[PDB]
Structures are given as C-alpha cells and as structure tokens.
Amino acid sequence: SMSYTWTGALITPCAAEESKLPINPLSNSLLRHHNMVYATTSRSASLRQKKVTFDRLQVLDDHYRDVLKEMKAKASTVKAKLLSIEEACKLTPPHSAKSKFGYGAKDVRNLSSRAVNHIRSVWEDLLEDTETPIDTTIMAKSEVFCVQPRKPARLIVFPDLGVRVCEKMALYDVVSTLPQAVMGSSYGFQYSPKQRVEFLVNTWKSKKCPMGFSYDTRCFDSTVTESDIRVEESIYQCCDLAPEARQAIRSLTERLYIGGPLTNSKGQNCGYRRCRASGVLTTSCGNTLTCYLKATAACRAAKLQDCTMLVNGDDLVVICESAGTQEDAAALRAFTEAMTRYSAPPGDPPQPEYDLELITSCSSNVSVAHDASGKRVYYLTRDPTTPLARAAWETARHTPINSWLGNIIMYAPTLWARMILMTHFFSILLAQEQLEKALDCQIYGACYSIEPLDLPQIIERLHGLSAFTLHSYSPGEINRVASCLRKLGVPPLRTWRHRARSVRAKLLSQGGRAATCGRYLFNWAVRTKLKLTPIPAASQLDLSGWFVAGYSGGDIYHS
C-alpha cells in the first residue's frame, strides 16, 4: 500500500520558523561562515513528502519466517511489568508537547488532577476501543546542518500527550528490555561509545580476513509495512503481560502503530499514514527489531559467511568473513536484492570495506590514537560538521536540548570535541557564571539533566582517563577535521590553545569542581602537564542506565 496519502492540506508550522544562523558575537567566535549554517523548516516539507511517499513492495520467504521464529522463542523469556500512571508521568520530559486537552508537560510531571484524570480516560479508552484510528499531528522537524557542495525537513508524526503517557504505561518496560533479550550482543543501544568500539574492534580482529559494510535503507520509516508492525506486535505479545498491558498493546498497534489520520498544526485534515510514525514510543525498538529481522534473513539468503551485525534503529552495520573481492561484491549485491524484496531498498549503495576506520554506522566510525604512554587506544568519532553547526546555533539561541553537551559526553576522546566544544562552552559558561546550572541533552534519544561541572567524572567513567591524554591522531581523522575547520571558517588550533589556556587558568583559580575541569579537560593545552589520577567521584556514578535502549522520538526523560 501507499506509505502516505495526502488530502492536499499543507504541513504548517505552529509559529515563526528560524532558518538562518543569527549573527551573534559568541557563535562567530566559534564559526565565521554563518551563511553556511541553516535550520530546516516547513518550507521544504513538500520536498520530503515526495520522497517518503510511495507504494511498498514486500515478498516474505522461509528465511524471513525462520528468523522471526528464532526471535519469538527469545521474546518468550521476557516478563514486562506495566508502569503506573505516576511512573509514566515521571518519564515525560519537561519540554514535551502540551496536550490539547487542557494541560501540558509540567502538569503531567506534577501529577496534576487534570492531567492524570484525562490520562486515565485515554487508557480506559484503549482498553475498550480496539479500532478507532488515534489522531496524530504531523510537523516539519527543525534541524541544523551545514550546506553541501540542502536537506529537506524531516517529517515527524506524533499523538497527543495523553496517548504518549499511556504508551509508556503499556510498553516502556517492553521497549527497554526486549530488544536486548531478542538480539543479544547485536543490539547497539546497550553499548556506551567505548563499548560499541570494543565490540566493533573485537568482531573485526576476530575474522581471518574481515569485510564490512554499513546498510542505509532509503527512508526506513516509510518502508515499514503494516505486516512489519503486526509482526513486531507478535513479538511483543510473546512477553508475559498484564491483561491490560496486552489489550493496550493490541489497541495501540491497530489504532496508532500500523497507521492513522494526519493532522497539521492548524487542525486541518492532512492525510493518512500506513507506515512507521517517527514520534511514538516503539519507533526505536520497532525499527531495530524489523531491521534486525530483515538483515539477518537477508544475510542467510546472500550466503555471507560468519556474519556479525550491530543494529541501532534503522542503522545497520555488518562485519563478516571475506570470500574474496569478487565474491564479496556479489554476495553484498545479493544481500541488497534480498533486503529489497523485504521492502527495505538501499539509499546509499552499499559497498564492501576492508578498512574498519572507513566504515560509517550511526554517523560515526572507529579510529585510533595514543595515550600519554604511547599506547594505542581505539575510540569513536564522526565528521564534526553537523556537531559544530549545531553548537553554533545553540550558542546563538536557547534550546531545550543542547546537542553540544551530549556531543562532548559521547565524543570526549576526539580531537574536535576537546579542542573546540570544551574550550568554547566552558569559556561561555564561566563568563556568564553558569557552570553550576544543569542543562538538558540527549543520549540515544532519551533526555538527561547534566551539570557541566561533573563532565570530568563522567568522561573518566565512560571513556577512561586516557580521554584526557589522547594525541597523535590518525592522518585520516586529522585531514577530516582540518577540512571541516576550513569549510566552516573555524579558528585554527593555535587560537583554541590560547583560549583554552585562559579558560583553564580561571577554572583552576576557582578551586572545587571548576579547578577539576581545568586540570583534566584542558591539560592538553599546557606544556607543564599535571598528573591525572582517578577522580574520587568518578567511581561513584550510576551511568549504567544511560546505555540500556534507544528512545528517539519516544518522548522519554530519565531523572
């Protein structure tokens, strides 16, 4: 069937939309080519609509059905718990879209009478009505990028705040534990960046002669069929569930997940969806399971040897035993025709790779550098273009989520995150006296509140002390960063080194946690190195909850 059907009504914004980077005194210090940075808006919604609108073709075979059964057998060991209204409300982010039923996110978190009672009524309705298509709002997503040698806006589809809390009640526990139980070491969200690197590096070095590839599915959400969503539910149903959880899942599947009506910001009937909605709680889990199912069966059809895959939502990376240049190419091509028949056609054409560093998955790649003792250490990195573009936008405007804070956490070991992101933001925070002020960021889609001052501990626990001593990066990594800096008009190392030394001196004079930031975060900027020993508060953090599952679009907040 058609992924989408349009009534002709337009995808409208619910307020003025900013497209250009403001000429701000602070952003310009970070990036000078401001005309190269832009924010996607509803003005390009039509372009995206055309790309994501098409009739899906799907042909299922014995491999598909075989993998499906293997997955179900594992789901059969799970027991989900069903969250209480209160627990569910607590998972709602403070900046979550307000309900249209007389209350907002703050009211939800405060367990206000009007939020709870309405939420209760939406839940009773899921138990009683198993058919009526639940209403969804479709909006053009606002995302920042750097122009290329422009991306149309992404389309987000999400139901009312009331339905969102209900999703959590019924499926939060399911989407947090089932993926790992069914996919094992292949589920990527259970890994922190260092651990994802470990898994990739080990899988790679474990092969006699490794061959790997990333697989980009052209517009994955739209390739998701009604069959995929019901199959997905068949997996969730293998869990021991509370009677009401079971019914809620059944109802949500038929009324929300398989598809439903689309309404714009003006309340006008916009169209109908028969594919994956990006803004629901099961998106990440549903995409991971579906992508894992199709790719696993495709590998079997393609005769790829000793396949090892890692999956994160629609993102897929596979590593296997090479059978020779020619054979590998053919087998990969076969894998693709197999994924195509499963309604998962390729966007970027897949290509075999024999150099781990060149393999890009989850927009990142493994690279290597050396610690103070000259020891080789592998870490995760990525092209810094988008991160810096977004850092500049966030420097000019206030935003609910601060991608720069998340990028510093996830990419702490990198040359670019350390030299620029850390130097730039600590300079601003210290100048505005806001080092104590906790800010929100996202990790695997979930929103977290983090105090800039705890970064030292955090970084040590997640990456190890070597994160503060890496040097001698790969020429490939160095060429990519330098290339990025010239393009965006970012000041050279010498300038950052000077700003970093000043930032550090001030941080040290404040003592306490600030001084701790100055010592560890910016030791690279001084010649007279300091001895970096384990930080006491480090081995006392509870970061385990950070890497359990993906939640992008799931409207999740972790206190």
Q: Closest distance between ligand 1M9 and the C-beta of residue 531, in Å?
A: 18
Q: Closest distance between ligand 1M9 and the C-beta of residue 356, in Å?
A: 19
Q: Is 530 in the site for ligand 1M9 (CB under 6 A)?
A: no
The interface mask with ligand 1M9, positions 489-518, x = CB under 6 A, is ----x-------------------------
Q: Is 473 in the site for ligand 1M9 (CB under 6 A)?
A: yes
Nearer to Mg ion, 18 or 216 (CB): 216
Residue 493, contacted partner among Mg ion, ligand 1M9, none, CB below 5-8 A by kind: ligand 1M9
Q: Is 143 in the site for Mg ion (CB under 5 A)?
A: no
Contact 108, 118 (CB under 8 A): no
Strand partners, 364: 361
What is the DSSP annotation of 313-344? TTEEEEEEE---HHHHHHHHHHHHHHHHHTT-
Nearer to ligand 1M9, 482 or 508 (CB): 482
Q: Closest distance between Mg ion and the C-beta of residue 346, in Å?
A: 9
* Per-position b or e across 242-256, b if 16+ CB within 10 A of its CB: eeebbbbbbbbbbbb
Which residues within the stretch 475-494 sit at the binding site for ligand 1M9 (CB under 6 A)? 478, 481-482, 485, 493
Nearer to ligand 1M9, 191 or 524 (CB): 524
In a 10 Å sphere around its CB, with 0-12 CB exposed, 13-18 middle and 19+ buried, how is residue 538 labelled? middle
Q: Is 425 in the site for ligand 1M9 (CB under 6 A)?
A: no
Strand partners, 228: none
d(CA 196, CA 6): 41
Q: Closest distance between ligand 1M9 and the C-beta of residue 473, in Å?
A: 4
Residue 216, contacted partner among Mg ion, ligand 1M9, none, CB below 5-8 A by kind: Mg ion
Integer-rounded Cα Rg, in Å, for the chain is: 24
Nearer to ligand 1M9, 524 or 551 (CB): 524
- How many positions of this chain bind ligand 1M9 (CB under 6 A)? 12
Nearer to ligand 1M9, 296 or 523 (CB): 523
Helix (H, G, I), strand (E, B) or coil at 516: helix
Nearer to ligand 1M9, 93 or 456 (CB): 456
216 labeled part of a ligand binding site: yes
314 labeled part of a ligand binding site: yes
Q: Is 357 in the site for Mg ion (CB under 5 A)?
A: no
> Beta-strand (E) ranges in 405-485?
439-443, 446-450
d(CA 257, CA 102): 25
d(CA 546, CA 219): 27
Q: How many residues does the chain have?
A: 559
d(CA 122, CA 130): 12
Q: Is 216 in the site for Mg ion (CB under 5 A)?
A: yes
Pairing state between β 308-312 and 269-273:
unpaired
d(CA 287, CA 300): 20
Give the range of 10-18, 175-183, 468-476, 502-510 binding ligand 1M9 by CB under 6 A. 468-476
Give the range of 27-35, 213-221, 320-328, 450-458 binding Mg ion by CB under 5 A. 213-221
Residue that the structure tokens 């002390």 belong to: 465
Q: Considering only residues 64, 524, 547, 557, which one is a binding residue for ligand 1M9 as defined by CB under 6 A?
A: 524
Contact 549, 176 (CB under 8 A): yes
221 labeled part of a ligand binding site: no
Q: Considering only residues 471, 511, 529, 545, which one is a binding residue for ligand 1M9 as defined by CB under 6 A?
A: 471
- Residue 316's CB is within 10 A of a number of other CB atoms, namely 27
Question: What are the residues binding Mg ion (CB under 5 A)?
Answer: 216-217, 347
Annotated binding residues for Mg(2+): 216, 314-315
